[PDB]
């Protein structure tokens, strides 16, 4: 079937992928803008190609038709997407089935059901798993009340105000058509059921062009800060054996009814044993490594070869779903260059220093974070994905404290000693922290000043 | 009053000693705290090198505690940029 | 049939692998038994068919043996490395 | 008698052409074989560059393959040592 594979993206993923490919005895084609030319994704793959020529580089990586130009001139039979840019789009996975190269992803259906938040609460429906409850649509006054009262409180108001009262209702819901006769311009206003304190669950969902699908267990990404993954960890350690099995079910029940087909993620909120979907992702995310290393399944491999048109059980070679293992835990964090003693905003500059901790249950998915790179403003500020893992969820965390201790990286200011503080804490421990666990938590936002002897007297050497 | 005030300035609780000092000469010890803060603990450098800095090729090493060692060589010094900038080329601590 | 050579009373250079296919953090274990502690009661290890066995790992020395001079270890600056990663891959890295 | 007289000389089968580019020019074929050992494929190179080097804080790519490419900037040129040795600070592909 596919000798060579380009991937549409940048750093750690494409990273990732390239080496699934290489493991599959792929060739790869790698694409980079001028401005990431020193990133190392792009000297990773056997063959490399500049695109976006001109224009800014967010751009470059979104500009279809150069990218499969270069896919063609190549000679690649296969498109990995990645997670973030194309990867969702529809436009490009049917314009890139269109020119005759595999998308690696789901079928074109899936992107635009799931792409839009209507039809995909709609296809949740009609596979009869529970959704947030909505107004249906936008809704008049009288209206506003009447979905508060089935349901009941408390509530959330959208052009978004919290309503916890009849009385706040009103006061919710006409300053809100002042909020937003100025804002937008548009007043059209609905409501949804609020869900007070959730822990955010997601579960990972391989099925083949052959009808077989599986779930990966799942993933508990509680731990957010204005809404942002901080850290995710796997299983839910912090909900029982039969509740999460409950969750998962769900997930293939809503993919066995669409016939989902290669990677995808189902986004759960959870709450005092219910649970609501809000999303699907139809790709590979960013915290798959962790479902990777309690399950055994290599993702972005099976990725791949869903691709060629091979079957999960036959040729793959995963098990039936409950013959599918459950090792340990795994807990992953994103060390980026978000200075948390300046409002985490993404340090840039040189990086002076880097070497990569490692050992027994440390796993290492590195972006571009090495000694001399010059972390430019124009991409996200990913620097190195750690995961760590273990038997007891306990010696996992052990783990994890270790190596971010162990990083010595200097240039650039980083998120480690937020991330110290955050693995420190005992809610988080316990397996038990929300999705208002941090922003609830002040105690999180103290940082012992760093004294760098080694780069401060290297300044005063120099000095003089 | 003035701990309070000199804990905010300098960012931590300020020993009594710290305070007098603050007291005695104020200025000074603000100005002492910058240096510390872009410079660190310059005592423990050998006089010539506190002075004079560093020769290229040279080889030292800073005790900083018992048992901790900050192992210095220096290997090049650039020339200036346009910015007037050097680049200075150390190995600390094999690094 | 099966022949006795020999006991290693220590830890091994090849324990990583074992780790791996267990998940029995074996040097926690070394020091945790100097301890006084329990296999089973404290440290936390199921009993003996309840080991773990998940599938199977591989390791390898990269040594400075160079094969096309008769494996006679070779000296002198390193110029060049980066340690790779991801899924499957465990890095015990020397100097 | 040739053919393999010289592939003991360069160390592989040589081609019909380099057999004859060795009986026409036996010495200067042998140096070009040193030369290629001691360079490489500066054919690729930019004449300019060929010819003169790099200037300090330059940047360019050489073509290899198709969609294999090395980037070089050129960051500092030490003084020599004692052995009239230099040491030049190039960044070959962001290392």
Do not use: W
Not at chain 1, 286 to 292: C, P, Y
Not at chain 1, 305 to 328: M, T, V
Not at chain 1, 393 to 409: A, G, N, T
Not at chain 2, 71 to 89: H, K, Q, T, Y
């Amino acid at each position: 079937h596919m000798k060579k594979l380009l991937v549409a993206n940048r750093g750690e993923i494409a990273v990732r992928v390239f080496r699934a490919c290489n493991e599959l005895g792929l060739s790869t084609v790698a694409v980079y803008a001028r401005e990431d030319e020193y990133s190392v994704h792009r000297f990773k793959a056997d063959e490399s190609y500049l695109i976006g020529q001109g224009k800014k580089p967010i751009d470059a990586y979104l500009d279809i038709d150069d990218i499969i130009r270069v896919a063609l001139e190549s000679g690649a039979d296969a498109i990995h997407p990645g997670y973030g840019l194309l990867s969702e789009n529809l436009e490009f996975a049917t314009k890139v089935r269109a020119a005759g190269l595999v998308f690696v992803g789901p079928e074109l259906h899936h992107l635009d059901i799931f792409g839009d938040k209507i039809k995909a609460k709609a296809a949740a429906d009609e596979a009869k798993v529970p959704g947030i409850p909505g107004t249906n649509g936008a809704v008049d006054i009288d209206g506003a009340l009447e979905f508060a009262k089935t349901y009941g409180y408390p509530v959330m108001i959208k052009a978004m105000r919290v309503a916890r009262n009849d009385a706040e209702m009103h006061d919710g819901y006409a300053r809100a058509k002042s909020e937003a006769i100025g804002a937008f311009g548009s007043g059209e206003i609905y409501v949804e059921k609020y869900i007070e304190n959730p822990k955010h669950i997601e579960v990972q969902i391989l099925g083949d062009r052959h009808g077989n699908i599986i779930h990966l267990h799942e993933r508990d990404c509680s731990v957010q800060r204005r809404n942002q993954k901080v850290i995710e960890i796997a299983p839910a350690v912090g909900l029982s054996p039969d509740f999460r099995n409950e969750i998962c079910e769900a997930a293939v029940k809503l993919c066995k009814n669409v016939g989902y087909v290669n990677a995808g993620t189902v986004e759960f909120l959870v709450k005092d044993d219910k649970f609501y979907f809000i999303e699907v992702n139809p790709r590979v995310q960013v915290e798959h490594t962790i479902t990777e290393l309690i399950t055994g399944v290599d993702i972005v491999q099976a990725q791949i070869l869903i691709a060629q048109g091979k079957d999960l059980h036959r040729e793959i070679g995963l098990p039936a779903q409950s013959e599918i293992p459950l090792l340990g835990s795994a807990i992953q964090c994103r060390i980026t260059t978000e200075d948390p003693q300046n409002g985490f905003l993404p340090d840039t500059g040189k990086i002076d220093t880097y070497r990569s901790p490692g050992g027994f249950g440390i796993r290492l998915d590195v972006g571009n974070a090495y000694a001399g790179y010059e972390v430019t403003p124009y991409f996200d500020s990913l620097l190195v994905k750690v995961c760590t893992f273990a038997n007891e969820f306990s010696d996992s965390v052990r783990k994890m404290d270790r190596v971010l201790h162990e990083f010595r990286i200097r240039g650039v200011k980083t998120n480690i000693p937020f991330l110290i503080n955050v693995i420190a804490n005992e809610n988080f421990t316990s397996g038990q922290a929300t999705t208002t666990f941090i922003d609830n938590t002040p105690s999180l936002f103290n940082f012992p000043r760093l004294r760098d002897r080694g780069t401060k007297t290297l300044h005063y050497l120099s000095m003089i | 009053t003035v701990k309070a005030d000199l804990e905010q300035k300098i960012g931590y609780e300020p020993g009594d000693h710290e305070v007098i000092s603050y007291i005695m000469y104020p200025q000074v010890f603000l100005d002492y705290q910058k240096m510390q803060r872009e410079f660190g603990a310059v005592t423990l450098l050998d006089t010539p090198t506190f002075l004079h800095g560093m020769r290229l090729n040279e080889k030292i090493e800073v005790q900083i505690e018992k048992g901790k060692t900050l192992s210095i060589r220096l290997d090049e010094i650039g020339e200036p940029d346009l910015a007037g900038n050097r680049v200075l080329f150390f190995n600390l601590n094999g690094q």
